[PDB]
Amino acid sequence: MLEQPYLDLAKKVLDEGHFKPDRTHTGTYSIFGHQMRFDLSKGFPLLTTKKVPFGLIKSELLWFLHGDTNIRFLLQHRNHIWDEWAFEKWVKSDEYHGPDMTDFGHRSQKDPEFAAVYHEEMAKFDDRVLHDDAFAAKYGDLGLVYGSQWRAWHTSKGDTIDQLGDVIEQIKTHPYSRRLIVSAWNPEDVPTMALPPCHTLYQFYVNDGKLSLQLYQRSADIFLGVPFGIASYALLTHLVAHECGLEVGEFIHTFGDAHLYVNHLDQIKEQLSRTPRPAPTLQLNPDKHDIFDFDMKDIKLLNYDPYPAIKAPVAV
């Protein structure tokens, strides 16, 4: 079944997984060096053993494709994944004249009252980002995020490079190249970044009229992270392919530190007791071609019949 590699990877971290400490002082079962492949011709690798929000995955990838880094786009799309990061910048700022917020996330877990307070301050921050144009420009712009790494790499000459744009043209004029690489890792920025790119780098490959993509993920949260990651990059492999008039090949997910937080063990076992149903089908608008111009309505997901969602706490 299409999503087997994932379950396999999951089962493995449990079995061969060696305990290992980490930043968000929780424990993890980790493995180092893994690689799994998904033959995109057999279907879309969005998990059926647990409900994954394709809407979220879809709007995030577009945000990246637009070379956008401001949270406003996502919010307009009911997407709040990157919310914490902008909120945090806001709170550490001179203007934040509100309640105690330092460590809002980790605190909310065992909230002394926090729950509503945090959740409301956040509602406020967002609401302003959506309307106060100047506020959005200030606290709503994350800066160095995938959108800017992929499409506006800052060069030593104060210029900007559209890695993705260039690779796409390359694919068209030189499909057999081995230099079709887009990179999110900048040695200059990581020493002072909030969260250095987990999706460190990806390579494209063309053969027999099919497009393939390999991702190198330096670090991954098997439970919460991987499900989206596989969905996100498989989508990209289709999008880029659609634009180049190529057939879709394989999506390959390679790992550095693949781990499962100690507070996710029961949940994952639950999942491992499920039987994958047939994988869904992706449908891209035939009329449109420049993916940089793709809109949500141009991406349909057909036949996604999943098992109920699984709730598990974010380890912090």
Added chain:
Amino acid sequence: MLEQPYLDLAKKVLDEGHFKPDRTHTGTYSIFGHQMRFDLSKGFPLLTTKKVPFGLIKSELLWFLHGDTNIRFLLQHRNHIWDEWAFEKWVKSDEYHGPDMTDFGHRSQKDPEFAAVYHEEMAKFDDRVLHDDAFAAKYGDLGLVYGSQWRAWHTSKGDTIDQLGDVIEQIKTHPYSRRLIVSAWNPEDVPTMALPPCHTLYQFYVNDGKLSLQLYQRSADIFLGVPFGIASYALLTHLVAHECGLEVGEFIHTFGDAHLYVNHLDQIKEQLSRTPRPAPTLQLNPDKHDIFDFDMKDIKLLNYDPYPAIKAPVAV
């Protein structure tokens, strides 16, 4: 046997290998996405099924470790791997007042007279690089090569970053980090580089007091390239480990485009008819610790009993 993964990878490219064109207009049998691991506690993965020059591998890695990019060091060490690149720069220069040299490499294959001519001009170039200090500074400095990528990454602020130095300190003060990454890929330089880094990026990992390393090689020549690559990075895993007082773990080689040139098929088959002997043993000088200060004499290779070398033409 330790080197099995390599033979396995080799056998595979023959069997599942899909023909694919390439730059040096020759043909290739290619696969996309492969990963193999070598448990460095079982021995050193320097091939016994064919003689690999450990001396060359050793002096090259030191050259990188010194953050050096001038060919003089290598020549002083009888190492000529990077010779062509500096020679080419020399020939395309105003000063090169010699015979016809444009395409020296590919031509030498079916030399109309070239052999000696090229080989002598080269001897001249080198000889000068070794003695004429100003010549070395001019035509002997390659510039952007591993030594500068690893230890003097040029930032947008005209400064320089010692990625390797920083990662080593990191390993010591934060061994459980998932950000121990050194990168040779610069989106800014690749568009105008002679040869963008095949050894694209590598990640370190520490667990149970052992050090592991994973390399991401965007493109590889299974026959001529991989044998050195495995040797080079396994050596680094030992060196860094020796410096951090860690035990050696696994070396993991991940691949983008792994290929075998069509003009290497017979030779590789020859190799595949050999039986691996026990792997050699690496011995590092116990007295020395700062690997940036390691000298050739500080690296011993014990019990290397290989099969005679295999000669095969460099495809161009």
